[PDB]
Design an enzyme around this catalytic site. Structure first.
Site, short mmCIF file in Angstrom:
data_model
loop_
_atom_site.label_atom_id
_atom_site.label_comp_id
_atom_site.label_asym_id
_atom_site.label_seq_id
_atom_site.Cartn_x
_atom_site.Cartn_y
_atom_site.Cartn_z
N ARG A 24 4.14 -2.45 -5.31
CA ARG A 24 2.68 -1.73 -5.25
C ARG A 24 2.98 -0.64 -5.50
NH1 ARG A 24 -1.22 -6.52 -2.58
NH2 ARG A 24 0.28 -5.41 -1.17
N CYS B 18 -0.25 -14.71 16.18
CA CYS B 18 -0.70 -14.09 17.26
C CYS B 18 -0.88 -14.86 17.90
CB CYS B 18 -1.14 -13.03 16.21
SG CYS B 18 -1.81 -13.53 15.09
#
Length: 342
Positions: free
Chosen positions: A36, A146
């Site tokens: 992108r 996480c």
């Protein structure tokens, strides 16, 4: 000084690793990919890096071999295109969940059938506080989730020392919005999201698998993730009970024993003052895991707490720390930021 390239550097995980690597003396960031934003300077996506590097995103097809390759692609993608990327470097640091689990069937339950099941068990799970020895010889390093990181660091010592009764442990995590990634969704439109507390994944959280596989002795553990509107941070809280005889002093000793000398573990033992418990706000931007607990005397109930920045200690930071171990470099290299106050 090794060369290192990052795949999926326009995302939060890869961008955080990019920031960290850029100030690491023994690393030379070669290429950073993005379909992108191909051709765009990196600060176009990561404004904090304005004027700090001349790197520009290149399409992944332009990827050249390097000493170290960091993979920060959407979950499942790297596994489907393993051969293509694994050929680019002898050392692979995958931040995705693709190669975190050993049991092929455990993976399937939370992610669907793995495309390269025989590869599971080859990457070494990146939690230095638990597998430093194995990481020293690991060419394939798998970053941990996480929430998984926060949960494992707070609970491991207790289970390792037999501190807790065998009853279910209930883990409630207060998480952030960056944990959801850089890709937008209708629920993430700022005015729609700000101020809200979104029960996010009350049951069946995929990080449960990671937690169970890396804790000693088959413990029953349950997770519930609640997202506040903070951008970064995790406060892991766990409900459980201590076996009889365990005092507060004993529990701290269990932690001191398991984590003695750990550069990134801070036991928050504070009887007085304003800041007595782990607080994600203060470890923001840092690679520290702040740990504390409170023992309910008359019930034996123990409330465990761990706070970390989900993108640093919970993602890119621990991955780099693990890379420092593998490369024989000081573990704190590129990870010494102390955090701010106020």
């Amino acid at each position: 000084k090794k060369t290192l390239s990052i795949v999926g550097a326009s995302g939060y995980a890869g961008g955080e690793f990019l920031r960290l690597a850029l100030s690491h003396p023994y690393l030379e960031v070669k290429q950073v990919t993005s379909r992108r934003f191909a051709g765009e300077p990196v600060h176009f996506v990561h404004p904090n890096l304005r004027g700090r590097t001349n790197l520009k995103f290149v399409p992944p097809e332009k990827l050249e071999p390097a000493d170290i390759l960091v993979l920060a692609l959407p979950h499942g993608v790297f596994a489907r295109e393993f051969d293509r990327y694994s050929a680019l470097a002898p050392v692979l640091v995958d931040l995705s969940a693709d190669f975190r689990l050993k049991d092929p069937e455990l993976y399937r339950r939370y992610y669907g059938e793995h495309p390269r099941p025989d590869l599971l068990g080859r990457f070494v799970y990146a939690v230095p506080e638990l597998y430093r020895e194995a990481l020293k010889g690991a060419d394939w390093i798998a970053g941990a989730g996480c929430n998984a990181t926060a949960t494992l660091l707070g609970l491991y010592p207790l289970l390792k020392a037999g501190v807790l009764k065998p009853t279910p442990i209930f883990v409630t995590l207060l998480i952030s919005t960056s944990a959801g990634g850089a890709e937008a969704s209708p629920a993430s439109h700022h005015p729609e999201r700000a101020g809200s507390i979104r029960v996010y994944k009350p049951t069946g959280h995929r990080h449960t698998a990671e937690v169970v596989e890396n804790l000693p002795g088959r413990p029953e553990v349950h997770l519930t993730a609640i997202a506040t509107d903070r951008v970064r941070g995790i406060l892991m809280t766990a409900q459980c009970f201590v076996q009889d005889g365990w005092s507060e002093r004993d529990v701290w000793q269990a932690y001191r024993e398991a984590y003695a000398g750990e550069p990134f573990i801070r036991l928050v033992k504070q009887k007085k003052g304003v800041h007595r418990y782990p607080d994600p706000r203060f470890v923001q931007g840092t690679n520290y895991a702040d740990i504390g607990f409170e023992l309910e005397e008359d019930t034996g109930r123990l409330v465990v707490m761990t706070a970390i920045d989900n993108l640093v200690k919970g993602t890119a930071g621990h991955a780099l720390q693990a890379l420092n171990v593998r490369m024989g470099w000081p573990e704190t290299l590129g990870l010494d930021f102390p955090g701010l106050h106020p």
